[PDB]
Design a protein around this nucleic acid. Structure first.
Lengths: 163, 163
DNA sequence: CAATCGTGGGAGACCTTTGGTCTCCCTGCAGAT
DNA sequence: ATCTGCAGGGTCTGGTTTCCAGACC
DNA sequence: CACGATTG
């Protein structure tokens, strides 16, 4: 009945689907940090864990998380940060009682027919709006594709289908 | 009082110092994982959380953790893994109730007079043997430097000094 | 704040002290015992 | 099982597959 | 994707 979806990146999000069909999606909490004398964004460990502790999803609920798979052409910092986000979320989810299933981007994109798209981010928001019409206003912006990815991971995990 | 030290990497370890002077150190739990058709060690998230939950250190105890600082010349996989281990430990520690204080390796090495050695791993084990003589048997092997780093991080936060 | 674009990048602590100097890991995989 | 050495590296799902093709942040 | 930077 309950399913969680997590886009773990800095502009990512967590989506919670209840058995009555309602849904919530939360932007990933972050803070601004100093590194090598510049500012950078970092996930907010305590707010994530606090977020997970107030969810109504019971222990045992499966959380489907986007598998970390950076391109070899991405910088060493890209690799560090996606590795870090992944581990922070995985530990946080496990410590808060949820079962964690990593899902490759190719898996849920094939499942919703999103593969090989020229506008993959827009498409993911369009698909999330169709599957979660009451979230349509929370998906209007280009920067909301993180919210879309989370909802689509949860929708994948629940076995939802597009019309 | 109570202090925790964490070497977060795959051969790392967590050390726990109690107020009566006694000490425990545990090797970091790991599992073997298939990745891109080869086998790789990865930290064991469940076992880490379970270990933290069995510690007698009370809530709010400070956990000193080695800051992740990979070299610009380490490969992107190096960056991903150290980022991943760091995030996994930080979240496990916050979620289990401990305060987290990252410590740069240069900080506890300067504190114990270990800067600029040509056998830094052996030296770290030697220093932790002197600080924790009842752990001397658990530091015999060169692969035990991670146990030594965890113990020294904890010794740093407790303010211990070498004779 | 929201978008977009192009390339892929250390970070840290203390000093010489408002910028300079110098220090620091680890992963992943072959091979030897 | 422990260690030594050395350069710094994608990974993943469908292939009704035996390593390939194509795909992804 | 992250990391900078620019542009309304």
């Amino acid at each position: 009945g309950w399913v969680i979806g997590v886009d773990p990146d800095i502009g990512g999000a967590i989506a919670v689907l209840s058995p009555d069909g309602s849904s919530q999606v939360f932007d990933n909490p972050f803070v601004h940090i100093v590194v090598s004398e510049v500012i950078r964004k970092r996930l907010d460990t305590k707010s994530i864990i606090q977020l997970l502790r107030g969810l109504d999803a019971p222990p045992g609920t499966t959380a489907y998380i986007e598998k970390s798979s950076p391109f070899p052409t991405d910088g060493k910092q890209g690799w560090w940060s996606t590795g870090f986000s992944y581990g922070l979320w995985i530990a946080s989810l496990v410590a808060s009682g949820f079962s964690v299933v990593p899902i490759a981007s190719q898996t849920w994109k094939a499942y919703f027919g999103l593969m090989r798209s020229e506008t993959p981010k827009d498409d993911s928001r369009q698909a999330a709006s169709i599957l979660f019409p009451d979230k349509d206003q929370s998906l209007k912006l280009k920067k909301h594709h993180g919210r879309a990815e989370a909802l689509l991971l949860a929708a994948y995990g629940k076995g939802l289908v597009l019309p």
